[PDB]
Amino acid sequence: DCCPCPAGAVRCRFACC
């Protein structure tokens, strides 16, 4: 349930999209 940015840890957020 995210928009996966390159860290994977907390970078997994929809905001990244």
Side-chain angles (χ1 to χ4, degrees), residues 3-14:
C3 262
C5 259
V10 68
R11 269 301 241 201
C12 203
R13 293 148 65 166
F14 197 91

